[PDB]
Amino acid sequence: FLELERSSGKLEWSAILQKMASDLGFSKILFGLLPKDSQDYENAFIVGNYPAAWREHYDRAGYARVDPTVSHCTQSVLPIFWEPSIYQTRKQHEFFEEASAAGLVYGLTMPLHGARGELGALSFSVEAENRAEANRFMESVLPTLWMLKDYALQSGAGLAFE
Template identity: 30%
Template sequence: MVDIGKVIEEIQRSASSAEAFRIFCKAVEQYGYDKVCFTLMTDHPALGLQAFHGFATSYPDDWMSHYMAQDYYSFDPVVYRCFQSPAPFFWDDAVAAQSRDPAKDDKTLLTSKKLMNEAGDAGLADGIGVPFVSMSGELSAVGLSRDRPVTERNYHELAEVALLGNAFHDKFLSFYASPTVPRMTDRERDVLAWSAEGKTDAEIAIILGVSAATVRFHWNNIFKKMQVSSKVLATCMAIRLGIISVQKPAA
């Protein structure tokens, strides 16, 4: 069983992007995913980075070279799904979604099928995708792969991997920016601190003696200040930037 909190702390303490990637890869390997590919799917002007497939990857070099030479990025159902939805997904769902799209012609579908077959031969038989979308619309994602198909879907594990992916994404890209610490109100820090303790919005509302609508109001302000759209990512950033600590706040 993976200790999620411990792994997130290790990622946050990493001294380089390479170390953050190594820790993330080691963690997801415990779920059976032994290969990882982190891609900037759109330009990230705030960081001065351009779109780049395999910005950090443990995929085989020969597969990456073949993938790019065949222009498979334009036909990849996993890439297609990342642009369609920010939710984590299993690869076979991405394949099914692309096949149902009436806008996709026969050439695209045939090339996609060829791509997935060749990926399986290269040891990338199955996997999951975890997209990340910033408030400014910048898109990136991690693809996690294994050498054999998943026999039974485990959505709990999918959620855990997505949580680890968000922590990795935040820390990895932090090495390419000079972060400024946004000014938070006491209530906003309270919301973030209790979120770090795993509390839901409803539980935070009870603890703080406010309505759930007020908690959502604070989250909206937090998102604007941090330029993120995920509570998990906002909480991870708050810990990394020293806005909150992992110790439980006073009720």
């Protein structure tokens, strides 16, 4: 964990975080953070290895308003796993359909709530045969991810905002 705070630049920080997650079985991650009282998702500090095309489409299509993982993070500090049942509206189902196309079917999002009011999300996406297997994979490393999201929050907020 230490290496995240004693890293020095965003490039290096992002690599380390990507490697920690990868080491926990996750090939794709996203770390997004907004400062206090903000809503400018355009100017949101973003880190990880989501497909670049998905990221740009996401941002263009205003999907942050449709993404149930985002609304959830505004309302809780607890993780949300990407289950069909979180995608409820037609919009959300079509978002689900596209997101699954970019290779984001299975995963979870840890809400991020910082000391200085920072708001964010750390998502981990995993590859598996089915949901039952994906969930086993995630559940096995869940207490580590839980520590990791707070470590990432503290060090990344310092990067993004100091």
